[PDB]
Design a protein around this ligand. Sequence first.
Ligand SMILES: CCCCCCCCCCCCCCCCCC(=O)OC[C@H](COP(=O)(O)OCCN)OC(=O)CCCCCCCCCCCCCCCCC
Lengths: 486, 55, 90, 64
Amino acid sequence: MFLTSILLSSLYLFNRILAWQGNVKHFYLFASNLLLLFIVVLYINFNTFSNSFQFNFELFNSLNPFGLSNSDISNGLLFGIDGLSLTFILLTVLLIPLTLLGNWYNINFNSNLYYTLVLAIGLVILLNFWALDYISFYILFEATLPLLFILIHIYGSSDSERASFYVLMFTLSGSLFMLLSIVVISIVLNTTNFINHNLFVLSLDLQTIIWLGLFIAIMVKTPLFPIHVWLPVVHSESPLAGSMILAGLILKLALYAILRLLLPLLCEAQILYTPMIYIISLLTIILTSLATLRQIDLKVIIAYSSISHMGIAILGVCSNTSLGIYGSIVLGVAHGFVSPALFLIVGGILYDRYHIRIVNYYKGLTTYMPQLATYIIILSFANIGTPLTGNFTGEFLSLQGGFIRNPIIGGISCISVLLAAIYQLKLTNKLTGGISSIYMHRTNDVTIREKFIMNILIISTLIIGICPQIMYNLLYWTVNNYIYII
Amino acid sequence: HGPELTPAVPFFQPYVLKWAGVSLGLVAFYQFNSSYEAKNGHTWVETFFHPKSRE
Amino acid sequence: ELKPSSAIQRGPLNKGGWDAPHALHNDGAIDRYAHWRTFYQERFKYTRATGKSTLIFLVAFPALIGYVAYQSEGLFEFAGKRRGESVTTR
Amino acid sequence: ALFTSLVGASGLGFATKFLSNKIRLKPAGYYPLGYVFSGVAWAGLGLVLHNVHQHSLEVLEKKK
Ligand SMILES: CCCCCCCCCCCCCCCCCC(=O)OC[C@H](COP(=O)(O)OCCN)OC(=O)CCCCCCCCCCCCCCCCC
């Protein structure tokens, strides 16, 4: 009665704020900021000394379909966290008001629609990291895509239509074979579960088949070289919050799914296949970062940058090392900080003012906007692997873990420090320097809200950069968990 | 020989005040916990840490 | 004899708001250039140069890095080493 | 629990009455008594389905 009266009160308050204020965006910011307060109070009560799943709750059980269930027999949808989940949830929840902040004055026509879709996508990728079944991981893994289709199609550039199609198409088409592999697991074990599933052993000829269906879906979502194809256009023709939630959270969601779903029960498969992953990882670091050099458009460069950093990230995951797993997590969280700031710099401060994203128009942004050029350089250097930023901690421990498992793949994997600097500083000096452009008429300096978003997303890289030990209290179980060294 | 001065600006800009206030507050709170730990054997915010027992 | 009903009174659709004045002189040459570059794939055709790059970057380079990756799986440990100790397992 | 199934099935009924108001291009609270009508109807479907599941579990207990 109590938890129902809370909802009957809060929906009433929602209806009243609707009737009196036309927007909702205040109430959406308030709700997502309360979600922050709630998840950090869950972090206080979190026990780090237990490997266990601490805060468990079942939804949609037989004996109680509407709500919580305490029964001796469970067939609903399980939810709960360890350290490894919870890190991403932290990286999730502090991102969610910022994108709700990020379009506070851009969207004029249909406000309530856009902010509802953006908050709903953020809530679905909250609940992605809580899940504990294979099916309940997968139901919410794909709940995003109608909301993403409706968001990219209605709002965007002139090419909204093709980009909304590709974010349905490639993402769906990889996720279907993921479902094939999930079905084959669920009919052998007869239990989808994130708790028991390291105990069961499958045959090597049977692990050999199951692992392809999950791995090609992770190839689609962390875009490795065969399908890295939707990523630049679904960024380059997105609106702002869709691009931020995509490249900060969806790619790291598949980086999470390669840990949570594959490394526990495909171990004896996984050793036989680490050279195939190293082929595709090196070949998506070299060949996407080299295709960045020939680009006419400006959001597309930061998109291919995200491809190159996830290509560094996944060869720490499959490294069979403590160092590689921890480096992949710190890369994933630090890239989730640094990269939506870059999509703000191309999309918020620079597309709201001039509405054209071609690189050739933009020159000499320093002499009319000094503090924007200040941002553009210190976010440039934070992207490369220039240290004390957390991006280098991820890149360094990932390259070290990838050097453990195979040294010759780490030798050519290490040149990524060069290749990631070339295009980024080649963009940065073209934006920063020169006589101010004859095409661009002078506009306003960076406002207070944009500087607010930037200051947060840069401090949160610098704290992880100066001390990566601040979140080792969550992971020291889950760094030892996924290692298989007999 | 003149310096040819630009107009006067105040020292304590709002950003200097905010950033210095938050940083000095965090450092002062950290020293407060290091002093409170010697008196009582535990930090002050550890009293707020109530997780469930592992058993 | 079938026309949509009289009680519609449908009106025009605006997008609403403030007419932001033009902060950019668009160049016809730069816009035509960039529209040609983003939509390059609808006019791409296979030639000998395309065949050379498609052979070497999609077939030859994965096969070379593949052979190098499968030969060097359990060769090298350097973890604790000494003079006169071989580091290759084989 | 029997009570949460009632409240949630009545919530499904409130959702049907809301969405049926809002296809019609009406306001939300256009006819407020129909919320009560649809909520009690869909709650009755919840009654029926819960009792059928009770009896099915009781049949499964008697096979031991
Ligand atoms: C449309 C896609 C398909 C949808 C399929 C999934 C439907 C999800 C529907 C949303 C409802 C789930 C969230 C609410 C359920 C959890 C509420 C709760 O009470 O958690 C219970 C749990 C333990 O509680 P208990 O065992 O009773 O003991 C308490 C002792 N103090 O207490 C806890 O441990 C804390 C639990 C924290 C939960 C955080 C979840 C973050 C997201 C919250 C908003 C979710 C709404 C998303 C809406 C979009 C739909 C996906």
